[PDB]
Structure formats: structure tokens, C-alpha cells
Amino acid sequence: RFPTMDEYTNAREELIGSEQYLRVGGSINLNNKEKKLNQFILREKRAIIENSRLNKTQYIPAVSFFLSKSQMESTPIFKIIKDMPKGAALHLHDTASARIDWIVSNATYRDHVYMCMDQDNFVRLTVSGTGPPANSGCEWKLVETERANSGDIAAFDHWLKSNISLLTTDPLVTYPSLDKVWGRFDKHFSQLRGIIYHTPIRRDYYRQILEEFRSDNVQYVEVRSSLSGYYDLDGTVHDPEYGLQLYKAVTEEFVRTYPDFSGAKIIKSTARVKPNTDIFNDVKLSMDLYKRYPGFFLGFDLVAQEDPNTSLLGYIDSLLYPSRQNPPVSLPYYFHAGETNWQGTEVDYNLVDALLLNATRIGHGFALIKHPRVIELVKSRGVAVEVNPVSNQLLGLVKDLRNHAAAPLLAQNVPVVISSDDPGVWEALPMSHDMYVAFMDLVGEDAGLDVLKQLVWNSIQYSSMNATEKKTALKLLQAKWNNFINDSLIKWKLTNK
Amino acid sequence: VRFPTMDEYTNAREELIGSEQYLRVGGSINLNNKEKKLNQFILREKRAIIENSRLNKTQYIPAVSFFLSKSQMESTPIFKIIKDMPKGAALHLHDTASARIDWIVSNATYRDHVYMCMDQDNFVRLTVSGTGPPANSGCEWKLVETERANSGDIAAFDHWLKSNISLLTTDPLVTYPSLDKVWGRFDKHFSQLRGIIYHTPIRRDYYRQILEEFRSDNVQYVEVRSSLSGYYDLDGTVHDPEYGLQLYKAVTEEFVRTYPDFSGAKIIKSTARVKPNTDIFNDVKLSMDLYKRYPGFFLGFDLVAQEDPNTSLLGYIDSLLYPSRQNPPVSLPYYFHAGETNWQGTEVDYNLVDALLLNATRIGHGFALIKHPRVIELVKSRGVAVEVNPVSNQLLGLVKDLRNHAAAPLLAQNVPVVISSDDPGVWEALPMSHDMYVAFMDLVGEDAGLDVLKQLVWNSIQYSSMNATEKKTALKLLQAKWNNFINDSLIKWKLTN
Numbered sequence: 001r002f003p004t005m006d007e008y009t010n011a012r013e014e015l016i017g018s019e020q021y022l023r024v025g026g027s028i029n030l031n032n033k034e035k036k037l038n039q040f041i042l043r044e045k046r047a048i049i050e051n052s053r054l055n056k057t058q059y060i061p062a063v064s065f066f067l068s069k070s071q072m073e074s075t076p077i078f079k080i081i082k083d084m085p086k087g088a089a090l091h092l093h094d095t096a097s098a099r100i101d102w103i104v105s106n107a108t109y110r111d112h113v114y115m116c117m118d119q120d121n122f123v124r125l126t127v128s129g130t131g132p133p134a135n136s137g138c139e140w141k142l143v144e145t146e147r148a149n150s151g152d153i154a155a156f157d158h159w160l161k162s163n164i165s166l167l168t169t170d171p172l173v174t175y176p177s178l179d180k181v182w183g184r185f186d187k188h189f190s191q192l193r194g195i196i197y198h199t200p201i202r203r204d205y206y207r208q209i210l211e212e213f214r215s216d217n218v219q220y221v222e223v224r225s226s227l228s229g230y231y232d233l234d235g236t237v238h239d240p241e242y243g244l245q246l247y248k249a250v251t252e253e254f255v256r257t258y259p260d261f262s263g264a265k266i267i268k269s270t271a272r273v274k275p276n277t278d279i280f281n282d283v284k285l286s287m288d289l290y291k292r293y294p295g296f297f298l299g300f301d302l303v304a305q306e307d308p309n310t311s312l313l314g315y316i317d318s319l320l321y322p323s324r325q326n327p328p329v330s331l332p333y334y335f336h337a338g339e340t341n342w343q344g345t346e347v348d349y350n351l352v353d354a355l356l357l358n359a360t361r362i363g364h365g366f367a368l369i370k371h372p373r374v375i376e377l378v379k380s381r382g383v384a385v386e387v388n389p390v391s392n393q394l395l396g397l398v399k400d401l402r403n404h405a406a407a408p409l410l411a412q413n414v415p416v417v418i419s420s421d422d423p424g425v426w427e428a429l430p431m432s433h434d435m436y437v438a439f440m441d442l443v444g445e446d447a448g449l450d451v452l453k454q455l456v457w458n459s460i461q462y463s464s465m466n467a468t469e470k471k472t473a474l475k476l477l478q479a480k481w482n483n484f485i486n487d488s489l490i491k492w493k494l495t496n497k
Numbered sequence: 498v499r500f501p502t503m504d505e506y507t508n509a510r511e512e513l514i515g516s517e518q519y520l521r522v523g524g525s526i527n528l529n530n531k532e533k534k535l536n537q538f539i540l541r542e543k544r545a546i547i548e549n550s551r552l553n554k555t556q557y558i559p560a561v562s563f564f565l566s567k568s569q570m571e572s573t574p575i576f577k578i579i580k581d582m583p584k585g586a587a588l589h590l591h592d593t594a595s596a597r598i599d600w601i602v603s604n605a606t607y608r609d610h611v612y613m614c615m616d617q618d619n620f621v622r623l624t625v626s627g628t629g630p631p632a633n634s635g636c637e638w639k640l641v642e643t644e645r646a647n648s649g650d651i652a653a654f655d656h657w658l659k660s661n662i663s664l665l666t667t668d669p670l671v672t673y674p675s676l677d678k679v680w681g682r683f684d685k686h687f688s689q690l691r692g693i694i695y696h697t698p699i700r701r702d703y704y705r706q707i708l709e710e711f712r713s714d715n716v717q718y719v720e721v722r723s724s725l726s727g728y729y730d731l732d733g734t735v736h737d738p739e740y741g742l743q744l745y746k747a748v749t750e751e752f753v754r755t756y757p758d759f760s761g762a763k764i765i766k767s768t769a770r771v772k773p774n775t776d777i778f779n780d781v782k783l784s785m786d787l788y789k790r791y792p793g794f795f796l797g798f799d800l801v802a803q804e805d806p807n808t809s810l811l812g813y814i815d816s817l818l819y820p821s822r823q824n825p826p827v828s829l830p831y832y833f834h835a836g837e838t839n840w841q842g843t844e845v846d847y848n849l850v851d852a853l854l855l856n857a858t859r860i861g862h863g864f865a866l867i868k869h870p871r872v873i874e875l876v877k878s879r880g881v882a883v884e885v886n887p888v889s890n891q892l893l894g895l896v897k898d899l900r901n902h903a904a905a906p907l908l909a910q911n912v913p914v915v916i917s918s919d920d921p922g923v924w925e926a927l928p929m930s931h932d933m934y935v936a937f938m939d940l941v942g943e944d945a946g947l948d949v950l951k952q953l954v955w956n957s958i959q960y961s962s963m964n965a966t967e968k969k970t971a972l973k974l975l976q977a978k979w980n981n982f983i984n985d986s987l988i989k990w991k992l993t994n
């Protein structure tokens with residue numbers, strides 16, 4: 001079969017070429033400028049991989065984000081991805097998507113903010129305009145007083161940040177198991193819950209999400225939000241439709257201010273710890289908001305730790321209720337599903353129910369590669385999998401990110417969008433850190449700008465924009481992309497090759 | 498309405514899940530009534546341990562480092578059942594790493610003319626010298642007999658030898674916390690034993706111990722990688738590879754004539770992939786000759802040693818294609834270690850492409866295979882079994898939580914797989930039971946039971962290199978062992994009725 005080296009080379013290159021064509025982005029044809037940028041990216045990628053391989057040292061893009069963040073930021077591939085327009089971030093949580101630094105430097109400088117140390121020795125924050133809060137399990141102190149008496153305000157503010165962020169130490173070392181790091185993650189939300197549900201802080205925090213995401217060259221976001229319970233200084237507690245209206249008004253003002261930004265849409269989330277009786281009411285609520293806020297309210301999702309809590313099947317009559325009405329109602333679902341290392345259990349079989357329920361996208365889908373028939377349904381229906389790589393590493397599904405279970409999905413061209421999940425919780429950027437690790441760890445050394453470009457286009461093409469909005473957003477994205485290519489050729493001194 | 502009732506929903510759900518069950522390894526097996534009684538007990542135990550980890554929020558011990566899991570698994574019913582179970586064959590083993598370090602200590606280092614020294618890295622080394630102490634090149638050699646007699650504690654002395662040689666004295670994931678640190682320790686182990694284990698009578702007896710130990714773990718057949726080379730006598734005489742093969746052939750014949758309940762052994766010549774292509778060319782020609790003159794005992798050729806930093810298959814391609822280019826062609830079988838890596842799109846994982854273009858009979862490890870869909874197709878189409886060595890892949894730095902092992906998605910697609918132990922002597926594993934336990938508990942799901950075990954066992958004979966007559970006989974023998982195991986198991990676990 002191979003009398004000479006040319007025949008062997010031809011067969012080898014046919015097989016390898018077939019796989020390169022099959023994977024995400026493999027059918028893209030780059031133009032001549034894109035090819036110059038691609039050649040540089042591929043030279044850079046090869047040099048870091050070959051150094052790790054042949055000089056026998058760890059591959060930094062795949063280690064704990066705690067260790068790799070400060071390392072990746074100085075490299076050309078990272079700087080290119082930082083400049084690159086991302087399209088959309090489609091998997092985000094609204095209390096976890098702006099900087100803890102803003103909570104500290106802005107929110108905790110507002111009037112009537114209190115702090116206490118809880119019984120686990122973490123700081124909690126809240127607002128009370130009607131006296132200090134009751135000493136229920138902790139002793140509340142006015143932040144303004146504690147800060148002014150600290151003797152070192154910079155250290156005091158840095159201590160707040162350090163006590164709240166999950167990247168203050170390496171979570172893989174400090175919280176070295178799934179349930180320990182989920183204990184720390186849940187705790188983070190408890191620390192901020194009081195302050196971040198105060199209505200004007202909540203409003204301004206959401207506006208900060210939009211500002212930070214635009215600043216990372218993201219033009220569109222879909223965000224999970226609980227919507228409900230925002231409270232005023234006088235103790236007024238608002239309902240979920242108010243919370244939705246609040247976000248709508250902020251988004252409209254943001255898009256008026258920044259016509260280079262496509263905007264935002266919202267998914268109602270509820271934690272999967274509640275009785276089925278209550279989930280039923282949240283489904284009904286979501287049916288009403290979907291009918292009355294078409295094109296801003298998207299649908300429903302169930303969140304919180306997947307392994308120990310209620311499965312989709314545990315809520316199946318609630319989730320089937322819209323489809324069973326006369327006439328039927330198609331309430332879109334965005335289920336977090338298969339965020340687990342388990343196989344053949346109630347947890348990863350959530351992926352089956354997600355498909356039976358016609359999920360528009362799947363959150364995480366870490367277990368999906370263990371399910372060949374679910375993979376085929378995902379591919380044939382075009383159900384995008386929202387892949388959140390830093391989240392899956394820090395929250396205990398994988399250590400070396402080259403073992404991330406989405407790499408084999410991308411190799412088969414399962415539809416995938418990259419997102420950051422909870423970037424504010426662990427000091428990530430809106431998209432650039434997660435896109436970097438996806439690019440360096442979840443695809444191969446010979447995968448270049450075509451993969452980046454496809455993942456960026458995917459985030460618009462599998463968004464929940466209607467077809468007209470998608471066409472408008474792609475025109476804007478194409479203009480950004482063209483500017484990014486020209487700028488990059490100038491910046492990396494590539495124009496003459 | 499697609500699902501107006503619970504029955505309509507569960508019908509669809511169960512057909513989908515069942516369709517995946519039929520597709521995975523073992524999915525077409527129909528257990529008889531006795532097998533079903535045992536299977537029901539295995540599945541109750543499996544669910545009990547998984548549900549405890551999941552709902553009581555504690556780590557799943559079958560998936561943690563073997564250093565931690567070994568003593569815990571050994572007291573459990575599922576482990577004890579797998580221990581009693583006939584394994585069929587171990588198809589991926591190295592002949593200097595497949596018997597107990599305890600035997601090296603209690604037997605080999607009690608022989609005349611055995612010397613020890615501490616090397617510059619503070620590790621003990623052992624060798625044989627018939628003339629006097631070896632030249633004190635980078636260490637000071639001392640007669641082991643004298644050192645033992647003067648230790649002041651013989652049992653502590655022997656225990657220290659074992660502790661200084663074993664990779665399971667501490668947890669390698671802690672003590673050597675990177676791929677290249679643990680490969681440094683693994684390489685060191687071979688250097689520690691190399692002198693003593695290449696002395697001819699010790700090497701003969703160590704190979705016999707491999708056979709005895711594997712038989713004792715209810716393994717009836719082995720295929721073994723060996724260098725065959727450099728076996729040396731007390732007077733300094735160094736034997737050629739053909740002598741090493743003839744030596745193993747005689748040990749094997751005596752063993753099978755002693756034990757009709759054991760099917761036997763066959764040998765694969767291995768060469769380390771750090772050598773110049775001229776050396777590999779000589780070993781390829783050697784392998785052609787031994788394949789011709791020892792049919793049915795000499796199987797073919799393999800390249801071993803660390804895959805990432807050393808020479809690729811393509812680096813030796815002129816040598817590896819040489820048999821097929823003879824007139825008339827000569828079809829030298831290959832059993833390449835391939836894709837034992839976390840890299841993607843590099844020279845290392847593309848070894849999988851060359852392994853299939855060179856018509857490999859089986860592939861060793863294939864850890865990267867799930868990232869290569871076109872290679873998967875060829876592996877399935879041609880029946881090229883992947884030798885999966887789960888404890889080895891964890892301890893030697895490819896994966897931490899074995900539920901992330903890259904063979905679980907292969908098994909879910911019914912890629913042909915055999916489980917093996919690789920270097921069980923190096924880290925105190927049993928011949929097969931520990932690896933079979935971690936494969937069963939980590940690489941398939943909670944609802945996968947005795948049918949998966951039975952299929953992996955049968956696979957190890959079906960994808961052995963036995964000829965038609967041998968294989969028919971071995972499968973009849975395996976069936977008999979299996980029936981005895983089922984009957985004994987029902988009595989032992991009080992499952993009758």
C-alpha cells in the first residue's frame with residue numbers, strides 16, 4: 001500500500017484532514033488577512049506546546065485558573081483573544097457577572113450598608129434603612145464606621161475582596177473536593193445576597209455587567225436571573241415582573257448609549273432545592289412573562305448544585321405543564337444539565353429529560369460525551385451546549401483542562417458556545433479567559449483562528465435572537481471582526497507576510 | 498400534545514435510555530437467571546456506594562488515587578466478587594513490572610552475589626556481580642547479604658527495600674505532582690531493579706512468578722511485552738534476544754503442562770522509543786525473523802517508554818514500513834502503545850493515525866482516541882482492541898478522577914476494549930482485579946452490571962492473538978470458569994433463592 005513515502009504521507013494527511021474538516025470550524029475558508037493572523041497564532045500555539053512537551057514542564061493553559069490567570073495575560077494569543085469580538089455570552093448568572101471590586105469600591109460605600117462575620121468566619125453584607133439588622137447568628141456593624149476606624153482603608157477594602165473572592169487562594173488546593181468547593185461557592189452567594197438584592201444596587205450591578213461585557217468586546221448577553229425580591233430602603237419588596245422591567249429599562253438605556261452593543265435578554269432561574277409545588281408556580285410565572293415580554297423574557301432554567309438536589313424528572317409534571325395546556329404553550333427551557341462526573345445516574349440522565357423537554361440550549365453538558373444517542377439528538381436538533389471551562393475546573397469536575405469533556409464534543413462538531421458562568425466570583429473577565437482556555441485546552445495544536453471564528457459566530461447563531469435580530473447582530477459582528485483582523489495585523493507586525 | 502400522561506413520557510424516556518444501554522459494551526448480553534441473581538446484588542451494592550457519595554456529599558472513593566482507594570475497595574463485596582471472577586486474559590503487561598516487588602526482596606535479594614547501593618538521587622539500586630563488587634562509578638556497592646546481616650533489624654531492612662522501590666509507598670499524585678515528576682519516579686524504578694532483574698536465573702524465575710501470580714488472580718492467559726535482550730550470567734555472558742524468547746517459551750510450556758486450567762502466554766518484543774532509528778531498524782528485522790521462526794509464540798513488535806517527549810511512530814516510519822515493502826511482503830504485527838497523552842493535534846496523539854495505517858493488531862492506552870473520531874471509526878471497523886490500563890493512566894499523570902478517564906466514552910460506544918494492569922508490580926496492584934474494579938466502578942455507569950464485566954472478560958480472549966483452535970479451547974475453558982464462579986458466588990453471598 002505504501003511503496004514510497006509519498007503514498008504514506010498522502011494517506012496520513014487524508015485521515016488528519018478529514019478530522020480537521022469535521023471538527024468545529026473545519027469548513028470555514030479564511031481570507032488572506034485572516035490566514036496571516038492564523039499563521040502567527042499557530043506558530044505561537046506550537047511554541048508553547050512544544051516547550052511544555054519537550055522541556056517536560058506543565059502546560060500552563062490547562063492548570064488551575066488560580067495559577068494560569070496571571071501567566072496567560074502576558075502572551076500574544078491571550079492578547080489577540082482579548083481584542084477579538086466575542087459575539088455573545090450566553091450562560092451567565094446575574095449576581096455573579098460583575099466585579100467583586102465594584103461591590104467593594106461602589107456598593108459598600110453606599111449609605112446603610114452593614115457587615116458581619118458569620119459562624120463560618122466569612123463576611124456577609126446587607127442593607128438596612130430601618131435600623132441595624134437583628135443579631136441573628138451574627139453581629140451586624142455599619143460598614144462606614146468599620147472602614148473609618150480601620151486605620152488602613154486600602155487594607156480594609158482589600159480584606160473585603162479577599163474574603164469574598166474564590167480566587168484569593170487556589171480553590172483546587174483550599175477546597176479539594178466537589179462538595180468542599182460547592183460549600184465555598186454557595187457561601188459566596190450567601191455573603192453577597194443581602195447587599196446585591198437591594199434594588200438600586202441590583203440595578204447598578206446589572207448595568208455593570210453590561211459595561212464590563214462590552215469592555216471585553218462582547219456585544220450581547222443572555223443572563224439567568226431569579227428576578228424577584230429586590231428590596232428598597234423602606235423595606236418595600238418588589239415582584240419578579242418589576243425585576244424584569246428594571247433590567248429592561250437598564251438594557252434599553254445601555255443600547256441607546258452604545259449602539260455598538262446588541263443588547264440583552266433574560267432567562268428566569270430558580271434553584272432546584274424547592275418543592276415541586278413551588279417550581280410549578282415559577283413555571284406559571286414564566287409562561288406569563290414569556291407571553292407579555294416576548295423578545296426580552298426567554299424562558300426558564302433550574303440552577304444550583306446538580307448532584308445532590310432535585311432532578312428534572314423530579315419536576316416533570318411542572319415542566320410538562322405548558323405543553324399540556326389547551327392550546328399548548330411552548331415555554332422555552334435552558335436547563336443546566338449533566339454538570340457531573342456521574343454516569344448512569346439520576347444526574348446525568350437529566351440530559352435525556354432536557355432533550356425530551358425540547359431544551360433550546362443545554363448548560364454545561366459535561367456528561368454528554370458519555371451519552372452517544374443524546375449526542376446525536378443534540379447534533380440533529382441544533383441544541384447548543386453552553387461550555388463554561390473555568391467554572392467546570394474550579395467547581396470540581398476536572399483538573400487538567402485538556403480532560404475537559406467538551407473537547408470530544410468539539411471534535412465531532414457538536415454545536416457549542418463558550419461562556420464564563422460566574423466570572424465575578426473568581427475574578428475572570430467576561431469572556432476572554434474562558435475563550436483562551438477553550439482555545440488552548442479543548443481543541444488541538446493545529447486548530448487556529450477558524451475555531452475561534454466559528455465559536456464566536458455560534459454565540460450569535462445559537463442565541464435566542466429572532467432571525468431579523470440575528471441578521472442585524474451578524475452585520476455588526478462582521479464589522480467588528482474585520483476591524484479586529486486589520487488591527488491585529490498592524491499590532492503583531494504581520495502585514496507583509 | 499406529545500406527552501399528555503406520565504406513561505407516554507416514561508415510555509419515550511425508557512426507550513431512549515435503553516437504546517444507549519444496548520449500544521454500550523456488553524449491551525447485547527442476556528444474563529440467565531443465576532447471573533441475574535448475582536447481577537441484582539452487584540447493582541444494589543453499586544447504587545448504595547454511589548448514592549452515599551452523591552447524597553451524603555463525600556468523595557467517590559473508587560475514583561480517587563489508587564494509593565487511597567486500594568485498601569478501601571478490598572473490603573467490599575463488589576471487589577471480592579471481581580477478585581473471584583475469571584478475568585480471561587491480561588493483554589497489556591511489561592515483563593519487568595508484572596510480579597511482586599516482595600518477591601524481588603524475599604527471593605532475588607537473598608541470592609548470592611547481589612549488591613546494593615544508594616544512587617545520587619537517594620534511591621537504592623540492585624545488581625548482580627559474580628566477580629566482586631561492581632566498579633563504584635556513581636555509587637558505592639555493598640553486598641546485600643552483609644548489609645542485611647548487619648542492619649540490626651532484618652524485617653525492617655527488607656521492608657525498607659520494598660518501600661524504596663514501590664511507587665505506592667506514598668501517594669504518587671501528592672509526591673510526584675506532575676506528568677514529568679511521576680515519569681521521573683517511574684523511570685527511576687526501572688533503573689533501581691534493572692541490574693538484578695536482567696540476571697538470567699532471576700529473570701527466568703521472575704517470569705515464572707508472573708505466570709503464577711496471574712493464575713492466582715484467576716487470569717488464564719497473558720500476552721507480555723519484553724525486550725528479550727541482555728539477560729546475563731554470573732560469568733558476564735550476555736545472551737541474545739532469541740535466547741530470551743526460548744527461555745520464556747520453556748517456562749511457559751512447563752507452566753501450561755503443570756496447569757491445564759491455564760491457557761498460556763505469548764510474547765511481544767518491545768523497544769524503548771528513545772533509541773536512534775538504526776536501533777529500531779535492527780529490532781524490526783529481529784522481530785521479522787522471530788515472527789517467522791516462532792509462530793504462535795512470538796507475536797510482533799511494540800515501541801515503549803514515555804510517549805510525549807520521545808520519538809513518534811513517524812520518526813521511525815522507514816523502519817516500521819520495511820516489512821511491508823519486502824518482496825514478497827512480510828506482515829509484521831504491531832501492538833503499538835499509542836495516544837498515551839493529554840495532548841491534542843500534536844505529534845504524540847497523531848501516533849494513533851500511524852498506528853492504524855501500520856495495521857496495529859491492538860493499541861496500547863489510546864487515551865487520546867476519543868478526540869479522534871476518524872480513528873475511532875477505523876478502530877471499530879477493523880476490530881483493533883484498545884488496551885485500557887486505568888490505574889496506570891491515573892498514577893502516571895493522565896487523569897485524576899477516574900470518572901474522567903477517556904475510555905468511558907469509548908466503552909459507551911462499544912469501541913473494542915480489553916482491561917489490563919500494565920505494571921502492577923510497580924505500584925502493588927493485583928494482576929487484574931484492581932484494574933477491573935476501577936474500570937467497572939469508574940468507566941461505566943451506576944446501572945451497568947455483570948453484563949459489562951462478562952463482556953470485558955470475554956473481550957480479553959476474543960481480542961487476544963490466539964489462533965482459531967486455541968481461541969475455541971480457551972473460550973470453552975473460560976465458560977467453565979464462569980459457570981463455577983456464578984454458582985460459587987450465589988452460595989458465598991447468600992443469593993440462592
Ligand SMILES: *[C@@H]1O[C@H](CO)[C@@H](O[C@@H]2O[C@H](CO)[C@@H](O)[C@H](O)[C@H]2NC(C)=O)[C@H](O)[C@H]1NC(C)=O
Pocket residue numbers: 121122123162163164168
Ligand atoms: C475571612 O476573614 C476572616 C477574618 O479576618 C479570616 O479569619 C482569619 O483566618 C486566618 C486563617 O483561618 C487566621 O489566622 C485569623 O486569625 C482569622 N481571623 C479571625 C478574626 O478569625 C478568614 O480566613 C477569611 N476567610 C477567607 C476564605 O478568606
Ligand SMILES: *[C@@H]1O[C@H](CO)[C@@H](O[C@@H]2O[C@H](CO)[C@@H](O)[C@H](O)[C@H]2NC(C)=O)[C@H](O)[C@H]1NC(C)=O
Pocket residue numbers: 619620621660661662666
Ligand atoms: C529511599 O531510602 C532512602 C535512605 O533511607 C531515603 O532517604 C531518607 O529519607 C528520609 C525521609 O523519611 C530522611 O529523613 C532521611 O534522612 C533519608 N536518609 C538518607 C540516608 O538520606 C529515601 O527517602 C527513600 N526514598 C523513597 C522514595 O522512599
Ligand SMILES: O=P(O)(O)OC[C@H]1O[C@@H](n2cnc3c2N=CNC[C@H]3O)C[C@@H]1O
Pocket residue numbers: 093094095096189225226269271303304305306336339391395421422
Ligand atoms: O439565586 P441567585 O440568582 O441569587 O443565585 C444564583 C443561583 O444560581 C446558581 N448557579 C450559579 N452559577 C451556577 C449555578 N448553578 C449551578 N451550576 C453551577 C453554575 O453554572 C447558584 C444559585 O442557586
Ligand SMILES: O=P(O)(O)OC[C@H]1O[C@@H](n2cnc3c2N=CNC[C@H]3O)C[C@@H]1O
Pocket residue numbers: 591592593594687723724767769801802803804834837889893919920
Ligand atoms: O526495558 P524494560 O523492558 O526492562 O523496562 C520496561 C520498558 O517499558 C516501558 N513501559 C513500561 N510500562 C509502560 C511503559 N512505556 C510506556 N507507557 C507507560 C506504561 O504502559 C518503560 C521501559 O522503557
Ligand SMILES: *[C@@H]1O[C@H](CO)[C@@H](O)[C@H](O)[C@H]1NC(C)=O
Pocket residue numbers: 047050051052054055
Ligand atoms: C527548551 O528550553 C530551552 C532553554 O530554555 C529553549 O532553548 C528551547 O527552545 C526549549 N525547547 C523547546 C522545544 O521550546
Ligand SMILES: *[C@@H]1O[C@H](CO)[C@@H](O)[C@H](O)[C@H]1NC(C)=O
Pocket residue numbers: 105106107109204
Ligand atoms: C457607584 O455607582 C453609581 C451609579 O453608577 C455612581 O453614582 C456612584 O458615584 C458610584 N459610587 C462610587 C464610590 O464610585
Ligand SMILES: *[C@@H]1O[C@H](CO)[C@@H](O)[C@H](O)[C@H]1NC(C)=O
Pocket residue numbers: 323356357358498499500
Ligand atoms: C417538542 O417540539 C416538537 C417539534 O416542534 C413538538 O412536536 C413537540 O410537541 C414538543 N414537545 C414538548 C415535550 O414540548
Ligand SMILES: *[C@@H]1O[C@H](CO)[C@@H](O)[C@H](O)[C@H]1NC(C)=O
Pocket residue numbers: 545548549550552553
Ligand atoms: C447518608 O449517611 C447516613 C449516615 O451514615 C446514612 O444513614 C444514609 O443511608 C446515607 N444516605 C445514603 C443515600 O447512603
Ligand SMILES: *[C@@H]1O[C@H](CO)[C@@H](O)[C@H](O)[C@H]1NC(C)=O
Pocket residue numbers: 603604605607702
Ligand atoms: C527463589 O525462587 C527459586 C525458584 O523458584 C526457589 O528455588 C528458591 O528456593 C527461592 N528462594 C527463596 C529464598 O525461597
Ligand SMILES: *[C@@H]1O[C@H](CO)[C@@H](O)[C@H](O)[C@H]1NC(C)=O
Pocket residue numbers: 001002821828854855856
Ligand atoms: C495493511 O493491511 C491491509 C489489508 O489487509 C493490506 O492490504 C496492506 O498491505 C497492509 N499495510 C501495511 C502497511 O502493512
Ligand SMILES: [Zn+2]
Pocket residue numbers: 091092093336363421
Ligand atoms: Zn450556570
Ligand SMILES: [Zn+2]
Pocket residue numbers: 589590591834861919
Ligand atoms: Zn504499557
